[PDB]
Symmetry: C2
Amino acid sequence: DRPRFSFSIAAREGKARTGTIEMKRGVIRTPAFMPVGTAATVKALKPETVRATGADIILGNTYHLMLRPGAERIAKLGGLHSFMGWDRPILTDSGGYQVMSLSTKQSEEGVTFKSHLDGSRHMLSPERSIEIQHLLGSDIVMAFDECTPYPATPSRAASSMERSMRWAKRSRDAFDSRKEQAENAALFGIQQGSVFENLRQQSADALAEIGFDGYAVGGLAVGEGQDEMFRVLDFSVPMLPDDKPHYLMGVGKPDDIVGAVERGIDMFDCVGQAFTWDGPINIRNARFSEDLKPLDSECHCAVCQKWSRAYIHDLIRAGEILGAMLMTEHNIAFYQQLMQKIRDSISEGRFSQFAQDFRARYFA
Amino acid sequence: DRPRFSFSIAAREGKARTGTIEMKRGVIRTPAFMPVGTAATVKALKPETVRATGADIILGNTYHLMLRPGAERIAKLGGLHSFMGWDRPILTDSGGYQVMSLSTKQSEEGVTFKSHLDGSRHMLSPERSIEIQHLLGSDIVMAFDECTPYPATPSRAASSMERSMRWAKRSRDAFDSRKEQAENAALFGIQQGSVFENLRQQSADALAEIGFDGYAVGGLAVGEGQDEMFRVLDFSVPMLPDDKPHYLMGVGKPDDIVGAVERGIDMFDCVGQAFTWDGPINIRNARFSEDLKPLDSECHCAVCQKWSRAYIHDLIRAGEILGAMLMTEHNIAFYQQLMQKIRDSISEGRFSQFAQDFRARYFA
Ligand SMILES: [Zn+2]
Ligand SMILES: [Zn+2]
């Protein structure tokens, strides 16, 4: 019988690590990329299709799910695994980021907001967020925090980091209050502090004192640019407990991922562009109209086995759902192949060379 | 090696027949229902999915294909079978019906029209329609005719029937002029004549004198209502050659199909509604919101194995493409199961009883 949660590091190179997270619903190979299963084109894909790319775990957006069709409904009707037809681990976010980006009255208690769909009124808080994630039945639950915009003044960055740490303790206690959740799921805390080294340190200290199963670096991929993001990761990741997973939320492009692994990150997610080893292409571009090759000539995915650039170009320009599904399937597969190459190269002690080789070709 | 075209009747009951059409690309069991493969939700389905429902042949709409991405492009790039990923027979229509319904200047030579997509100018004629269908590479080619609206005066019905027969001879000669098409594909002629028995007779006589591989009953499912349609089929079908397939274009609902088979028809096509043995339901209706049963409790399809009415209700109301795909897959599967029950009951000499039993439950 598998444990509730066990993270084992099998190999290291510099700050990079490769390993496994064992959970009751399955094993997650790290570094891991989590497709966002609650995307329309993603759910249009068979769960089997998503699994066949190599995904070990997918993400669900709590904000979208609570709004449509609702958490209590998902629960009464079987839970999110049944809803997604996905029997392996699922990570849910707290819902708070989409409140800020898509929907508000904020207070120390939580946030109230109006649905972007029907103007109905809704509430999130550390306690309600954890409750909804319990109702969904997810395996990895994110603490509910308060986002900091970029740029942010030091005073604001500090206030939102401090509130986030208070809310991290509330999230921990809410999670621990439900037997079924505490015994079967895992809880991740989120470090805040914007670009400020001392705030990041205070945040890491607070989260480690509370204790979580894994630690996300929050507050990045919000406008800062890759150099700044990498600079913040350089000092922030080593502040987190070494023996637990490190999750960079909302990152990102292939080169972001590679640089973030070089800095100690273990888990990633993000939502006409197709990825190739020679860089992204926009398939709508007229230069692909007579291009008979697949999206990427080394890609092993089912799309690249069967369909040309020329055909996918036509579908996407015509706005056909087949086009969007084919692009999404290939892109998910490309990301899983990237993660596999990363894991192999770290295990084999040649990840530095891999990162160099990857960049040379991807930016050529 | 399979013949270009062979229709064999294995069993009869009254005017109903069951049998097979053998073509180079495969066997078609009759009575047959042809899904329209050029539909967005239909093409979003795997070809394997469509095949797994039992479909032996699919239809392509020449009007849509010539407009986007174009016949010459489909040809240069591999042909419609490659384009659809479907290696079994494909029937294409002539394109003329959608010109009348979607796009005009008509003459004895053919029609010119403006694309409903970009205002570009296009032309169809018996010769150009046959040429485009050759470029697509379809297995069953429809003669290009002139549609008669409903209702139509006798004079108009006669003029359009007579023009259609002239155009049937032109279609025959164009088809016969291309070796690759004549040796490998089949050509169907279309009977016209509206609701008038004498015009239908003249039309059947003209088409039989020219000679085709199969004969469609045209000009129905255009507003007349089922009783009138059935009345026209009662006298029209027996006018056609008995030893060749009879195709009712654009029909239709399950009960239309059953009554049309009782009158001698062998082939059908048509484009929130789900079909069940207990009649159609609209899954969006609030009464299905807590309904945990599948769309139909006897249906063998992959959708009904896995998904509830309650869930599909949510998807369709939210406008999710997964919803439309699940509904389409189940509906295609339902139609193939209907056709299978029809074929079995005719072979077994109990089709009359089947039709009675079907109607009793479907309209209960
Ligand atoms: Zn691919
Ligand atoms: Zn079904």
